Design a protein around this ligand. Structure first.
Ligand code: MG
Ligand code: NA
Ligand code: NA
Ligand code: NA
Lengths: 251, 251, 251, 252, 251, 252
């Protein structure tokens, strides 16, 4: 049996029960090649799927696309094929002045500024990671030598108005999001992204283990775009960290 | 300047003020080749971008990925580059017994079961198309010989629970969506999809003209696999119709 | 055999399946007299009911009163007596500078700033007209020689605070409505009125065909007071247009 | 001289009135006014019929509201622009509790806000409650008329049909929000449904205006008995007699 | 049967069907000693319980603690033991300039700025007192010679941000509550407290009779500080008044 | 020097404490304080009993909260004014999952916000989340005690009765919102019910304070509604030993 969107079967996964889920399809091969015997399985729409081996055990790498809706499809269909643990990796921009480019963020909870999380649990339910995944990500990030921040991420269904950007076609932000960035800053939120609220809510309410780790590639309060060397090193560290976190999760 | 995600410039669009926006990146070239002088511009993440010419005028074709969040990025960045009219095309499944495979649906309004629409307008605001775009889509659809339905579409941030699917890993649907498919059926809703609420709300509240047309490729109330020829013909007709609707909007 | 509020039976309607529904009881006779053989049927509370003949077919004219609640009663009771198509006519202000006194607006969707719409469908559902009624209204309005605007109407349960009027007894506007007129202006909304959200939501979710057309008699953004002659012409044109729209709907 | 936009009257037309009786039906306005002295028709436009009269020498307005919070909110606002500060709603109603009998009177102590226009004056958390002096005067007038009086909560709906959980309709459907709602209100002690009190009471309690509602019971949803015309006629007449006596107590 | 939190039995109550419910456990004995034969029953957590006799009838005095949650436990457990009428007494701060220190407020309805009221009735339901109890409280307060205000009270789940206090650890007030005190002032709200919305909603929806009376001990709009004698007199008058209101409720 | 408004203490009274242990019941404050060095009573007002003690040479406060978010929010605010930055909640809880046994410990990783006071600090979208170091210390302290420990989501209710879907009550009714809610939380993997963690965690996570919750299971709601009182005394004793050891780990 082949799932509707991902184009793979349970046999294709070789017994994997853990997936690493980047957003960008072009990063899938790069993550798989950090492990042993990487194998391309399928690519359709924003979903590129590889398998590889980590300490002898099969691991899936599957892209999600941008946003909760496309992420929710990938997580569901991988769970149909036996995956139980989901490690999100990416890079991100921080919104607090003490966070530096090259630091890592491990999300301990997300502000649910999305719609798909409500398709799994009502708004009162916390978008929080599994404690073992969060523990493994913190340990892998710390062992990398980076400075690590554990804290809250704001997870938005838009890149522009929901992150209170005004440098846009209309220059307008709807009332709900006017003043929102300052509010999140004053509440200690570390960063914005666009998938964690869906991922964490769907997994925490469905018997699946999930977490999110990200390397910081810009501080939005300072707007200092990194040189190429620093960007490359931060991107590389983020995926090396997520693979070591997967290693810590294997049983 | 090059826009942040799509990787194209205003010059690359060569004057285009109208975009055709399918979901799947692999459909972009297939739409572009119905027009004159198609040229590939860029491909990043779920976003593949071509230009072409229709009756001497430039037209962009840009994929959106699945879901309102990735759609909202593409629409905003194309608008930054001068695009003012957005024609969504795709194929869909219907939820009314009287709608047959091969028929076309032109959306007159969407049920906002998404999150990104709320980043542009509060829930009270109607997710409705531009009337000229809807009229052009109806005319083009009828001129193709298909049976056309004008009506309401339910636009969900998930494929599974928000469309009241129970054939899933948990088999559960949150309270909000229990009994929902029958509620929408009794309210005359024609079909589910995953992008129109975001697209139509964002455009109608932002000075952009938008509409949606889709070919019906399955009927969820019927238990019948369509033949391959009928599916191919319906896909081909959907994109012929959207290009003819673009020709009507330009003229 | 009589419905509870309107005081008419199905036999009194002489087979009519289409109603013209103004708000003011005193306008019912005026609209009826534009058609053939007008006959007074009943008057109770805000509900004055006539019948007339248009191209040989019976048409009902029934006032609604101000607001969604009284409107919802008239629509339901007429539907119980066999009416399936409802054409709302009136006159309105406008909130966009480009809309002039004497122009006409055909609503493509309503902002649901009412309560009664929620008694038919949850807020996510679009308050949108039937496409054939909106098309007939656009055609009748344009054929009259008026400048016609197709677009979104804000439909408020109040005349005063929900339209952000400060020339009131308290001069207070509740937080929800502070700044709201500029927000709707920036979102492209054309006008305020007080019944379309209820009408359009109720009908679109209940298998009834509805639409709304209005003549513009004042513009909130303009200082010039309209010539009383232009007001009289606009009132007369509005009802001539809705009768022609009814002619185009007859089968 | 300028007239208010919908009601078609000026402050001078009211002869100093600071109290209004506000029925829903325009045809009941003259019937209330004639219980007082020197009733005079002022205007009729749309659902708004307006009379003045005198009670113990003081001017009183009588003005219909139409059905629903939206048309009611217009009448209250425009009357308040002309100096009216106290608003007494009267009408007749069904009841949803078995202990409330036809011919009894209900004085609303608070309303379930199943409307929209109340939200245009105060967020949902705000209570739709009457002025305590108005409710007190209504209770005293009702008791002095010989009727059995019930003080309690009224459910105030923007619809007559689905919001009152009626299924005998064109579609036969009731939206999810209102499925099971009649039994829910019954178990919470709610006495009756009507269609204007949540708007009226929220608008007035948040705007420095005094308001209350009294109604004669003319049917009981929970009963099958059909009241005859003399009983309905008696209940309608008593309801307006009671509201005029309540106005007298407010003016004293 | 011994109720779980309050630690009393029906026999301990000696037939009482009326309770006076202050917030502070230390005030229970003081209230009981205004009546005949005061007897300590139990003390656990924030719940101190006495019985006394008033005109020969048993009355309970039971503290609630601060907040709707602890109040809801006390009311429920007393109702299990036969109590049907609940008279809340306390002292409060007023937010209207015309309300003076030493005046008394009888609540005619509460703004539901709490959470526990929603555990008994949806937000649309009015947090309103029983009319007999409010009438008895008005009469007792007026007969004492105090100036009495009947009106709306804002009932907050917090002492600090929900009363728009900025003199706090963070100085932050969440968006919902920014500007809120001026909005309640403009709406004619008399005072803030922290239990009435829960108490009134719970009782009104559960067949129990409840009301609230308070003496004003501070006014947030007035700079002048009240003297010690005025405060001691106001605290003493508040409890004398509630006992006289209980007398008026006995049957 | 001024005392805080409700707690009746000054910063000097706390001897520089930056960590508080916050039980609900005033009578348990002394029981926790006596597990540390040099316990001293500071104040008692309303439901707030406050002691100071010393742990490995560092000052620690113990302060009761009362039942519910509203009284808890006062105590946390006023302790934070006096320099407290870390808050360790200890208490008992009712488990809702069948695999959790009486006497097990639960460390909350996030709370379902079935309260009102959390909304006075952050909108509903914001996660009621503990500080990660506090949750890590609580888990380690609970494991080191020999207890079986569960990490997971807690449903945090403003009521004991209907919001925890209890039916053995005066009316026997539960409002629509909460009908079927316990099964819904069970199917979503929620471990337990209590009444303060949503307020505590949301207020601290949005205000620069570190907080966590640990609780001993005294009842399993898949079995019964009201708990039994033998290992309960034993469960309470182990829970407070665990929270003191978690405090030691946070101070190290
Ligand atoms: Mg730096
Ligand atoms: Na996507
Ligand atoms: Na009306
Ligand atoms: Na308490």
């Amino acid at each position: 049996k082949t799932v509707f969107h991902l184009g793979v079967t349970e046999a294709d996964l070789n017994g994997a029960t853990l997936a690493i889920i980047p957003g960008d399809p072009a990063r899938v091969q790069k993550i798989a090649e950090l492990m042993d015997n990487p194998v391309f399985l399928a690519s359709h729409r924003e979903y590129t799927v590889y398998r590889a081996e980590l300490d002898g055990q099969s691991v899936v790498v599957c892209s999600t696309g941008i946003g909760g809706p496309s992420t929710s499809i990938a997580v569901e269909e991988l769970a149909q094929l036996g995956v139980r643990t989901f490690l999100r990796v990416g890079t991100t921009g921080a919104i607090q002045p003490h966070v530096n480019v090259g630091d890592m963020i491990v999300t301990t909870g997300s502000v649910r500024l999305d719609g798909a999380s409500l398709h799994f649990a009502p708004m009162e339910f916390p978008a929080v990671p599994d404690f073992d995944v969060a523990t493994a990500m913190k340990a892998a990030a710390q062992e990398s030598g980076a400075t690590v921040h554990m804290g809250v991420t704001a997870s938005s269904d838009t890149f522009y108005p929901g992150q209170e950007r005004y440098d846009t076609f209309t220059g307008r932000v709807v009332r709900r999001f006017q003043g929102s960035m300052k509010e999140w800053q004053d509440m200690g939120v570390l960063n914005f992204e666009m998938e964690s609220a869906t991922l964490l809510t769907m997994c925490a309410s469905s018997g699946l283990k999930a977490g999110c780790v990200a390397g910081v590639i810009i501080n939005r309060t300072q707007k200092e775009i990194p040189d190429h060397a620093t960007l490359k090193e931060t991107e590389a560290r983020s995926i090396k960290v997520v693979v070591e976190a997967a290693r810590k999760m294997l049983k």
